[model samples]
Target: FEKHGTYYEIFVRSFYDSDGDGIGDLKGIIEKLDYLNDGDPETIADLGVNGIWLMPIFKSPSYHGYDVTDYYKINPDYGTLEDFHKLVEAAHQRGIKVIIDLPINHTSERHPWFLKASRDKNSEYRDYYVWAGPDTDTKETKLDGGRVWHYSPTGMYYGYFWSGMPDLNYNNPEVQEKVIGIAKYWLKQGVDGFRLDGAMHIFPPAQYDKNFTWWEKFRQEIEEVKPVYLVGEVWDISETVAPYFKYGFDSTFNFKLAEAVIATAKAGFPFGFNKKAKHIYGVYDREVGFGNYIDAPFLTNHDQNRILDQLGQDRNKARVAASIYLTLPGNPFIYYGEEIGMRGQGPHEVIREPFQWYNGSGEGETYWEPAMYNDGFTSVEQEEKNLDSLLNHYRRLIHFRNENPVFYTGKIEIINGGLNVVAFRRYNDKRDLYVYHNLVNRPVKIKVASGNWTLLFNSGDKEITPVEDNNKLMYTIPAYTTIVLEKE
Candidate 1:
């Protein structure tokens, strides 16, 4: 938002389910608003978050909801438009805005437009899809084979993102007006913004200059209707991805930074993470206006494996990852099960399962249930009683993010004064906060000039000891704890 800043992205289906239909729905999300936002005023105000970003929730045939069959309707399983409105109203009352994923790049084969285009070459709707002509063939003279002509019963071929998701023809004026009209329709209904799914694929062109020109046109028309936050899903390296920031998008998912952060945390030295961070964040800061509108780096997303599991559940290594992600300046997105330590490697079908809910059961108890892929680790009814549960860890971690200003708006400096430990200085004119994390399972101490600081938050115990006569801070991270220390 132009005013307050901070975004908490909640994948609604994996969040919490009130209906318990083995799937999470919109109504179920509406039921958990207070918990998500935290019912207290000072808590939210201190949190400094202005908006919410949910993954796609339209009417799709599958569990992931990317396979959309209808552009105009909500999934029956998620609930009605009215139900979504109720969520908007409640969220607005709390001063929290909402944004949804708008999938415009491709449509499910089941969509009416795709069905019509698949029918006949002479059909009036044929141009509405990206179709190819027949093989004007002679043995070796055929430019493209059967693979190039993915069948649409008209003996024509259509562009698709998988065989099931047919790409829409942006060259078709009628399709452009309708899809663009749908954008305005949702904005008018009171959505704060939209995350354009597969935004780069919208105007695929033979020429680079021609592609950007088309983007500017699309953005200009969209700006005419209403002021909305538009972000893109252009996943590419920094140099290639930066240009789109010029025409559209208030911000983009910072993939370039995400990779470096992951590599540094898992294996590199202190200078390693800092160098990459400087490249990604520095380029965006220098090139894009508004002091870099990119989302801060994240270690993992729903599609990837649990980072902790990948780090071998080593607390020190995970802490280094957390230290960099939380401190760096950008919209820090923490995945659902990552805070309390959810671990799994999947083909994505079972990665996003039901959220673990807390009930007064028992401590450190593994609650298995039929709903989630882990079968029981993700069940809330089975795991809430323990004081050291993931739920409590998340509560404390979120609270740390809310309380710390340096993490949000401070200037960061990498102190390459050590090895085996990563350290940085987060400073503003009024205060200087020193942060350090050991990236190895072994207890390693590094020299820091900043003497005696308060322990802000720790994935382990609060009391951590400093090693030797020098200002060497020491903490045992077991295998997966992240500690935050604040210098006064």
Candidate 2:
């Protein structure tokens, strides 16, 4: 944490476009800064975050913004550098830091580097790309290769994960030096930090030894200019990827925990059944520090299907997922469209559709627009009026996490019990909070110790019913909801 770290991510084209050009831009984000950071900046205080991570903003030809033709310039469709400066200034004034995505994995074939390498077989730039020699005598090189050319037009065949994007030769010193230069240039421009795209694939061949060596060198190079916050997209098992932590990256998305908990939740497992949750948490904790184990507990990110869709839009299961996400230990990320009970109809592509911001009320280019779908599925105005809206749940849970330090810094321990009852506690010496969740639709009667415990909150359709039975305090977990209790 640079300074009490908390972050919010924004997708430019999907966030807002002030020009009404059917695309969101940096200028549009500047206009919505108030609603985003402090809806009422003048009277309101910091909105529980210190930084913003902007999605790919470089000169990319694709709508997703990952394919880059030029790393030096901003996407004209988004806005100019001048507009970007205004955003930085406005956010900084309100104590909001900014970070950006840097996709160094590969560049568009249209890039100068790729163009130069493709021009001549014997060109010096040939080594800048990966290539394999052709076998004129064998089908592997010529017949199956689909041409008489034994190798690349120059002499060697290059390796790229995708045909449209050619990976740079990190084995070359020039490439490494140039990348470091790009990072330094951005740091000099006032950007607070960077979210490294495809970090795990930096060394294409996956040379564990050389890959880490390069990362360590790069970390040192970046630190020399400024202590920039570097977050890698290392989506691998903790044991396999912990090595990168030593190279000085601040954090990574916790795929291990996220995958397991999500699977358990989807299976209709009781929330109080802390078996899986405890097992995963314990395994990672033993290997890494609490902070290093900064798991990004997200049900879905930009590319996958929303949790609601996966849960068959079952309100009960959805609510259970929310309860676990908010109460469990980790930094939970709610995707933009998730707050309104949004669901993707067909596949993953439709899942990342734009935020529906205007259908429910005032129309016109809203800060966020539905990228696809004729039926208005996402809307800021629709969410504004609904009291029981998913958005409200998100806001309330976020507020709860922010107000309670126990959720962020306290130790998370699971209470011993059968697999049906998933119970855990987050407590320090001064305060204690207990969360019990019954994942099934049955009216489960859960037991707490014999004492006076206050009902903190419950994620149920109606108010939680406190069962007055014997000395032990019992509560009915309404169908698919959870009840939180606290020691008064």
Candidate 3:
């Protein structure tokens, strides 16, 4: 696997609706492989992501599929197991790695084990879930403001997120073995790995270290089946998330860096993003040694409001924001519909609206949820036709990252980035390249190194002039633009 390759995150249910159902499915994903990456670099039509992370696809009662009912079965709504196999093969053929959300921290309240255990204390499956005695405190609160304990006729049950998602008992060695087996089952099916959902809370917030131990155990066993990638969702800021790197997980999302990037875009400043990223990486590097853990940097995901909403629908800011995060180190995860400036906010379901494929109504458009923010204007059909659209900007930059090895191999530094500009240097040995993003609403003049510089890329899709003054090259950067140049 290319550890640092660009990874596209897909909420399969909203990505593309195949079979004309009001939902997206595995067949939808299979059909859209060409849109992601056509396996031909000669064509510029694809998104060029080499890895994809699909949200939970396991059998579940909920629409989100996070509360997995059956780990062994695919969600019937998404399609059959045969459809999944075809999807993986298609993705592999397109040079895209496949990973699905594994929500092992909890099972659906309706899971067979939970159902059987809740009804009878004598059930052998009683050990599979966390249970409390009647005398124990049922008032313990969860992050979602709900009580962790829910009363059942047989006993008090623990459900961290909600009653629909009952917590699993990692204390039970049998349960641990069961999850490892589930992971192995997926790996054997030719799937690449997993995105461990609610990873930090697997052992409760109080017993955090135990969470690490369990994950390490899972990692050791999963690797024996296949040395695959395992990215986890440790939903916290940088410092708290650092330790998870030491125990296990090939990667975890950098929420701190993600927010910093958004803040930079909104403020039209660097927002101290690089310094913060360095500190986060320093903590991670110290924990697991240098280059041991890859970063899963992202702008926004399914859980957050769309970046377009964050930037107030300013495409310039969106484009510059894309430049900043895309140029960052490690494997950056691109949320579906982010490229075309998709509009979404408010509720979680609304934020995950169907991929806008047409101007009005067209094939494979899932209307599972009513779309409030995104409609005709944000469609892929509209953006692809416009060369200067955010979609094209993303396409340009993603391809740039793919073609330019410097982005993958070089070390980076922020250079006076807080001054209404995001400036950075990516260099290995003497091969240094300067990237500048003018965040403000006007062109800004910047002085550079003494040598003559060749204009490598300008997101403005226009010519920029550089003047030699006092042995320094002075370049006027355009408003809301990203430019890359190299000393010639």
Candidate 4:
């Protein structure tokens, strides 16, 4: 669980297509694992993401697959359970850890547990779901769209999300046991861990303490079987997310920091990026308690608008944002198509579009969205040929991060400069690396502490050379640039 590595989130149906069915399957991911990483440190074709978080591969009626019907069965569109075993095997062989999405907060209304609980009052599974009696007060518990209760002949069931996704009654010990049993079943299947979806929605608003207690018990259950990573999608501010980590989760997404990073790169905030970032880290340290916090940072995910769209499709801004994401502390998660600058907006399905693999295809072409096939966006094939492309920038930065331990394990100290210029030093006992980012569209000069330094990595046009004057290291950073310098 202490391992620091770049994790990649894959929306399975949109990632790659091996059988040419216009859908990405488990076999497709298995076939393309080498493209992700070949397990060889020397390989350049690999993207170098060591962890894979597969979005909801369980049996579901919907296309997005989040509303799961059967926790034990793999979606036939993706493949069989045997197919999943092979996928896990192939990933582990290539040094990749696999964590599946576990959306136990709710299940599809079609789930057998929900059906039985709702239909049969005397059924053994009757209490597996939350139900509101006709005499119960419904006004205070109403959700955004209206009543939180969904009607059936038997009773009114509670659903925090849409009616299609009925919330599981964690109050029921039977429900807790069933969910933990499902988790143990998956752990026995050789999966490394889980990305718990809608983690905060497990309990009602006034019952947050109950939510924390439930997660603590759940974590204990899973730990009894095996030690595994549990990253929760708290989807709230840092202060709100920190408590889940305290209650036994390993990590929670740092939404506050993600927004701060994006806003810094997109607008070049007049305040200071490093200062804001450091304050965020401080908040987590104070709230989550010492030695218990791990911040999962990212620019964008499947639920949000794509990073390219967020940054107005500006390559420089995208690269700057990526630099902050990769070099910052804790594990970094990359959405499937963020590296190549894919653009999507409007709806969730659009944001989770098929990965653009090739501009044109005959052989070796992966899947493309039928509605928008090769819509003039740069593809992996095109980017691979152009060394100056955004894809190469991501690959090189990822490679640099993996090669250098300072980026992973070192402490960060902000190096002061103008608002448009943000710099920091990441150092440990053995090594020191200075990271500087020029957020503007013009060159900016900054002075650093005295030391001869070598440019470790750059994400812009100009080459960086450390200038020594009055025993200070001075360097001019180019427009929309990110550079890492190591003391020599």
lDDT of 4 at 385: 85
lDDT of each residue in 52-119, candidate 3, tens digit only: 99899989988889888899999988999999999988998888899888888889998999999999
lDDT of each: 0.63, 0.66, 0.83, 0.80
Q: List candidate 1 segments past 4 Å from native.
A: 2-8, 39-50, 133-149, 202-205, 214-220, 223-226, 313-320, 358-373, 378-390, 428-431, 450-460, 464-488
lDDT of 4 at 124: 84
How well does each candidate superpose onto the true structure, as a TM-score?
Answer: 0.82, 0.85, 0.95, 0.93
Candidate 2 residue lDDT tens string, 1-488: 34234456666777676787667789887887765556332432223445678888989877767767898898998899888889888888766777788877677767777777888766666656666544433224321233222243455444334456666777889888888888888777778778775353335454757777877888789878877776666766766656565665666665666666566667765442355566656666666765565555566666666778778777556666776767666555556666666677565447656557676433224334345652476576776776556666665666567667677666788873234445678787777988776767677777777787999876555877576667777777766666778976
Collision count for each candidate, in order: 12, 16, 0, 0
Ranking by lDDT: 3, 4, 2, 1
Displacement of the residue 12 alpha carbon in candidate 2, Å: 1.8
Candidate 3 weakest lDDT stretch, 10 residues: 134-143
Q: Write the per-residue lDDT of candidate 1 for residues 415-487, one digit (tens) a residue.
A: 7635665667767777676666666656555454546666666656545665545555545443344555566
Candidate 2: misplaced stretches above 4 Å? 1-7, 39-50, 121-127, 133-152, 155-157, 198-206, 271-276, 345-348, 360-374, 416-422, 460-462, 465-469
Evaluated against the true structure, the overall lDDT of model 3 is 0.83
